Design an enzyme around this catalytic site. Sequence first.
Site, short mmCIF file in Angstrom:
data_model
loop_
_atom_site.label_atom_id
_atom_site.label_comp_id
_atom_site.label_asym_id
_atom_site.label_seq_id
_atom_site.Cartn_x
_atom_site.Cartn_y
_atom_site.Cartn_z
N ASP A 168 0.84 -1.19 0.00
CA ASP A 168 0.00 0.00 0.00
C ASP A 168 0.88 1.25 0.00
OD1 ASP A 168 -1.43 2.24 1.88
OD2 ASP A 168 -3.03 1.15 0.85
N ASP B 296 -6.44 -5.99 -1.30
CA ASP B 296 -5.31 -6.28 -0.43
C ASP B 296 -4.25 -7.13 -1.13
OD1 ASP B 296 -6.60 -4.92 1.72
OD2 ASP B 296 -7.53 -6.78 2.46
N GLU C 197 -2.04 -5.34 -3.51
CA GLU C 197 -1.04 -4.58 -2.77
C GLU C 197 -0.01 -5.53 -2.19
OE1 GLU C 197 -4.00 -2.64 -0.47
OE2 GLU C 197 -3.54 -0.70 -1.41
#
Lengths: 269, 276, 115, 115, 113, 116
Positions: free
Chosen positions: B62, B134, B137
């Site tokens: 991220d 998620d 990332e």
Amino acid sequence: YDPTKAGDIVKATKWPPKLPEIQDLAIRARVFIHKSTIKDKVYLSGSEMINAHNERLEFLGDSILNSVMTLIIYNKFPDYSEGQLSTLRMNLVSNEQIKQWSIMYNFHEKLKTNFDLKDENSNFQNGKLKLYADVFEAYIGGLMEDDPRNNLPKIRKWLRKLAKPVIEEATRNKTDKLDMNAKRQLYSLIGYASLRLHYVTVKKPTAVDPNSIVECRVGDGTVLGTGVGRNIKIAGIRAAENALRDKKMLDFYAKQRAAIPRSESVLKD
Amino acid sequence: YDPTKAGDIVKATKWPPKLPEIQDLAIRARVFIHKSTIKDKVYLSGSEMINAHNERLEFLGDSILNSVMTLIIYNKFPDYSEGQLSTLRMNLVSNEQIKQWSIMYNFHEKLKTNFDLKDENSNFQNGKLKLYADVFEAYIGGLMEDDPRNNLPKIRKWLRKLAKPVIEEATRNQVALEKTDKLDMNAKRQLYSLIGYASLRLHYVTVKKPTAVDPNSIVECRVGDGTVLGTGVGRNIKIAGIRAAENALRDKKMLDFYAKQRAAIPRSESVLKDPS
Amino acid sequence: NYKYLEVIQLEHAVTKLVESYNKIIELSPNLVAYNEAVNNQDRVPVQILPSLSRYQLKLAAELKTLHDLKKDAILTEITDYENEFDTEQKQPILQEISKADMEKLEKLEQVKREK
Amino acid sequence: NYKYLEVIQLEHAVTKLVESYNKIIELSPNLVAYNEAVNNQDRVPVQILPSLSRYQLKLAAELKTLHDLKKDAILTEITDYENEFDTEQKQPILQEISKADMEKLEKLEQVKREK
Amino acid sequence: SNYKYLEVIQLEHAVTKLVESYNKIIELSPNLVAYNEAVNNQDRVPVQILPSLSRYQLKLAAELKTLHDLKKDAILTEITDYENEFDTEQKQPILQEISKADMEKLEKLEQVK
Amino acid sequence: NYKYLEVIQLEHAVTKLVESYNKIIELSPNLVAYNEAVNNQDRVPVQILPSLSRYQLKLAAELKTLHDLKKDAILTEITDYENEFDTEQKQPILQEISKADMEKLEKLEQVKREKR
RNA sequence: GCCAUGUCAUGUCAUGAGUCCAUGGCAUGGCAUG
RNA sequence: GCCAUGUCAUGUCAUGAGUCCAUGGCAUGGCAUG
């Protein structure tokens, strides 16, 4: 090596870490020019305003700041969870913290603005004074915009130095580890359906008091354990370990279970 | 490409950009292990859990995602304001956008979990489905941890390719991202100089305020008796008013009319808002 | 001396001890299949990969190995112990302990009753 | 070869295995206190009497004795094994498993592939 | 018609500002020598002034002041005194760059019209 | 040397300077239309009459005229100055400033600074 | 806690050529959408 | 919109040795503080 209570008492400090230098004066000037100085000049186009004051530089720097800290702690704590990492990072990039680093370099005194910074009756004084944070971030952006290749490592070194004490302070503020199985253990040893062996939350954590108290009790109200912790889960675990340590007590309830007909034993009544 | 509309149709597609590859299988695997797979294993210490599933990597990813996008749009738009840069950046790092990117690589079909991903009655389906974002990332995180030196550039080039269409769509069709450069910031002033005097009650009215459905505004420029001298439409009341002003400034017969009207009126009455 | 709370824990510990070794010998391959798995890992399914960073599988394989090599010694009787148990035999059923050894320990505790 | 679901069982079993032996050595007396207790049962707490009728207690004592006589060997190794584990150590941690023992075995599975 | 009221008031305004502005410049601005010295040493310039050097306005001012010090002003100088040599009863150009020759060339370009 | 508050006035003054000339050339007629108007005033709108008494209109007309004759010289260079400005051109964008005109000045402040 | 866009109130500093008017910048806070 | 800590509900999957019991993981949402 500064105990500062020994022979180092009035000696000059090696602090703050030496600031990396922005070699482009065009850029060095700009980091310190706040927008209140620019946007009121009617003869400037919007483009000229944007290239004048520091808001672009704050933006870029804020990203590099957050980036560099994030790698730093990722490597230094290989076993930290994401929440631990994330929470720790908050201390490092927060408004209060960046503000502090800023004052350290007197950026607050060098910042050119359009209004009175020292007025103590000014409404600028009961807000966040985010500007002081901004100018520090802008310095990072300036260094980056000036020479991104050569200056990114210098920034790494520099920010690592600034970050180290803040980290050491947060990590302190080890011992035996929690048995995630303790409550199970106890039920195995003394538990049965009619004992109504249960946990009671005596205190839930609050902002004022960030702790919790959990009591482990049997049906008749007897408390076999107390535990105290960050949340109800940890506290309950610590209550169990408390109950697991009183062996005279364990032996008593184990003997009690052994004595009850499983007809009654397996019911909540 | 050689647009597929032209004579070679069945040629292999340029899309999606070649995925940079993680050479350490330990890490490549960890990217696809969700915690529901792990945290239920009672024989694992907490430390072993953290080093098993992908959350540390998601965290690392991220940041790099967010850092690289920041530089990319920063350099490509030297005259963008911070609000403009920030708004554009939201388009690149959003849940929806990253999720979409994730499906692009079929990461969602590779993600290991403990529950049914394809169950359509599952309450997982009526959420944000952030797990898919998620893992994408986490892939980036995987790349960095593997070889931080060689993979950071490949991440750069890979994401620049991913971002181009998304940027290009947003700069053209997003209202907040449009160009303010031919606006005369002195227009309302210019107008008042030419025709304005206090008792004329020359004022701007907002006939339409920006809303979630319709992010535009309409401001009418008016005198006291209600006459509309101009109309303008823009992202906010400030811009709309400016264009209303510019509208009025283009009508020269009207301007001449009001300038003469002013000349004929005695300083006060002229200099009062309500000569009563 | 012995207390109830210790006894219920002991029975449970012993039971699972043997039950655990049983499961291992049944399910685990010997050490070569382990070595093949760790020496590739590209044809090893992803979910099994974190398992290779941890000790359990290697130790599991090593024991299965000792079993195939019949150097088990102490642990096979452990698995066999229950059927070899009889209440009226007052003598140790493990032969790694000979009654030369018992002597040492028995006179050791009259020694600590002298303390 | 290795299956996901089986691997979870082995890992778990290996864990119960080590933890169980640990518990035994911790809680249990050796064979002298055992024999003393079983030979006078009127003076032992009434609830433990059936436990004395079973094998576990005797097996637990025998193992504990083995420990006191430092004849544990493998079992001492098993408890130390995790603390000796290194992923970057690629050869067996057991000293009963020798590079002289692991011929017979790897070449037996070079025998098994071709049939 | 030629002149409209709206055109007239903007013109009077523009001419007034035109004169007022050139005056302010000659009053305030150094010549190119000081300008060049500033740009070749920027580390000794106060920071709020640094952006001024990236923009055109200051150099132009310095260049104009320069023309002034060199007495090549002329068109711009006549402008500053023009009001004072204006008389309603003198009907021909106060600018000497407009000679009697240029004048009739133009009259017949709109007389052709 | 250069002072901040003076710089702000300078930059702004220059902007008005240019904007003002542009407006003049844009709106104004040349001297022939001026002369016709000033000579028939019953035919012009009543409201412009005082302006015809003043210098601004005539001066604008004269400037508009020079523009039409292509005798602008310096004033055209000024309106073009902005788009011809470059920070790495360190030499005068006005060509009436000769490389020759420059040193009488480099040196007069050269002698001026040493009595200092 | 925080961010973007939007909108409003108080304080302050500017800009404009008819100013008892008009338009903006900043700072501090309120509310709405995401 | 987004983040942390805390707390609660529902669905679901596991764990435990007396289980008509007990303990957790995940998912979706709520509330509080920041």
